[PDB]
């Protein structure tokens, strides 16, 4: 099975500069041309280069749209293909993938990591501020939780410990424009539930070390 | 404004078919999609513009289609399998906003569709 | 660069139906050199055809792709519940290997009009300086809706953020949310707090509103 | 650039 774990991401300032590596396995990896492709936010895709393989001289090829901040290079004694970034911009921001550029004369990308997330950006890494969001339908109630001005992602939202899950919807985060992130998680219930059930949600924000338990009344 | 005429109406047995007309006036519909509603206010279907496609109530759905005569600024409801239950006055409304978020400001009057045996 | 331009930007169809996929390219590609991509929310994407034609391995026979010069199509014959996705093509003939803006193939169903429910800010909130106001539109389709804030009957156009869900794998709907967000010194300048509703299944719009302090 | 990565252009 081929894998391609990409790592090295995660929050960086503009400016600086950050080193993702894609360690493989699965393959012989020597024998293949390797490309790194990045998705921004809710965008497309973008092709941010490849390098060949040593048999085929071991350059690199990289798109001008980048400005030459990039360097690819790879480790074929440990099966490593590296993105070497530099001088990143808020532009920057993206999930980054590792891919193996397939044999032959028509080398398309023929398998992709996961990716890794890269967060360009100056804001405080903190934990979000919960509050509630009280019910008041025929029938169906709902109610939820805010979960404002955390920074960066993710956040992870659960039910009473995770005994609740039927009707939930947790909203993918927003940037605000302060630069921190914001969303609701939502669940809805019977209207008859109300006055007698009890509806807590839980809140982990790994990067700030942060746990928070609310309970949502009426 | 926006005038609509719904018309092809009429009294059939259960299991027949009939087919809705909505001709509209004072403005060019080939931009808008185009909706049927039912009072048995039921949503029955929608046609949006050419290409974007047609959507249904599940309590229509495989039974009724909506089409376009942007030609003739006409849409047509198709109506088969019918049920004494789709005994309602069917109403057409245009969506005045060309994305699609249900801004229906002009409506037709209304025509009579009865199912009995 | 050789710009590559899909459409349509999204297609919606039933399983069963046949998807016909485009891509266009601002100057002439050797098929040999264009791909198609499979993209669905939170996954990498996955090789489909390669060389215009070709699929990749356990790649179903109901995926084909054709095309030549600056004009190559992506045919889904008989849509399957898990074909359901964005799909990209690519070149790679030229330098730069370049991607088009990708078309949605989404799943068709029936019409569902938006649940709608309102959320007075919390006293904990309130005791920060702030009032955030949160309007819920659940379980709907198709995707495209209005949310309008209203304030003591009066229209407000700013100061809100939007957020939708993907559509649900299980019953394919939508669910979105409109958020309101000012300071406790504008929030306490008026009664009445609304959100009004619009949605194609929706024959007029829906309202839930709720009165500062009560 | 040279868009071929299976093969040398050097």
């Not at chain 1, 280069?49 to 990289?62: C, D, H, L, V, W």
């Not at chain 1, 947790?170 to 809805?188: I, M």
């Not at chain 3, 098929?31 to 996955?46: F, N």
């Not at chain 3, 309130?126 to 955030?132: E, I």
Request: charged share 15%; net charge neutral; with cysteine.
């Amino acid at each position: 099975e081929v894998q391609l774990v990409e790592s090295g991401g995660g929050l960086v300032q503009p400016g600086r500069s950050l080193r993702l590596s894609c360690t493989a396995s699965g393959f012989t990896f020597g024998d293949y041309a390797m490309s790194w492709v990045r998705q921004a936010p809710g965008k497309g895709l973008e092709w941010v280069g490849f390098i060949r393989s040593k048999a085929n001289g071991g350059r690199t090829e990289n798109p001008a749209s980048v400005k030459g901040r990039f360097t690819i290079s790879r480790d074929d004694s440990k099966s490593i293909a590296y993105l070497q970034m530099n001088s990143l911009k808020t532009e920057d921001t993206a999930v980054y993938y590792c891919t193996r550029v397939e044999l032959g004369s028509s080398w398309s990308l023929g398998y992709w990591g996961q990716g890794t997330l890269v967060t360009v950006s100056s804001a405080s890494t903190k934990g979000p501020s919960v509050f509630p969001l009280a019910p008041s339908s025929g029938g169906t109630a709902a109610l939820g939780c805010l979960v404002k001005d955390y920074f960066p992602e993710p956040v992870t939202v659960s039910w009473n410990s995770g005994a609740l899950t039927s009707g939930v919807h947790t909203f993918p985060a927003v940037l605000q424009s302060s630069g921190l992130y914001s969303l609701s998680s939502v669940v809805t219930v019977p209207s008859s539930s109300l006055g007698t059930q009890t509806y807590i949600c839980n809140v982990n924000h790994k990067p700030s070390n942060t746990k928070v338990d609310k309970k949502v009344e009426p | 404004x926006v005038q609509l005429x719904x018309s092809g109406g009429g009294x059939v047995q259960x299991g027949x078919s009939l087919x809705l007309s909505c001709x509209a006036x004072x403005x060019x519909x080939x931009x808008x999609x185009x909706x049927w509603x039912r009072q048995x206010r039921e949503x029955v279907x929608x046609x949006x513009x050419x290409x974007x496609x047609x959507x249904x109530x599940d309590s229509x759905x495989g039974r009724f289609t909506x089409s376009x005569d942007x030609x003739x600024x006409x849409x047509x409801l198709q109506x088969x399998x019918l049920x004494x239950x789709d005994x309602a006055x069917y109403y057409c409304x245009x969506x005045x906003x060309x994305x699609x978020x249900x801004x229906x400001x002009x409506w037709g009057x209304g025509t009579x569709v009865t199912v009995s045996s | 660069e050789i710009v590559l331009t899909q459409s349509p930007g999204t297609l919606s169809l039933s399983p069963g139906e046949r998807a016909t996929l485009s891509c266009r390219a601002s100057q002439s590609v050797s098929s040999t050199y264009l791909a198609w991509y499979q993209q669905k929310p939170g996954q990498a994407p996955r090789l489909l055809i390669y060389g215009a034609s070709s699929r990749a391995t356990g790649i179903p026979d109901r995926f084909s792709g054709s095309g030549s010069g600056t004009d190559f199509t992506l045919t889904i014959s008989r849509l399957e519940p898990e074909d359901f996705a964005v799909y990209y093509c690519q070149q790679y003939g030229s330098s730069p290997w370049t991607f088009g803006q990708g078309t949605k193939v989404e799943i068709k169903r029936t019409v569902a009009a938006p649940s709608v429910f309102i959320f007075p800010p919390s006293d904990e909130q309130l005791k920060s300086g702030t009032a955030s106001v949160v309007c819920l539109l659940n379980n709907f389709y198709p995707r495209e809706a209005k949310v309008q804030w209203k304030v003591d009957n009066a229209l407000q156009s700013g100061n809100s953020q939007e957020s939708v869900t993907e559509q649900d794998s299980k019953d394919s709907t939508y669910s979105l949310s409109s958020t309101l967000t000012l300071s406790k010194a504008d929030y306490e300048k008026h009664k009445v707090y609304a959100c009004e509703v619009t949605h194609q299944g929706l024959s007029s719009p829906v309202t839930k509103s709720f009165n500062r302090g009560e | 650039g040279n868009p071929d990565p299976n093969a040398n252009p050097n």
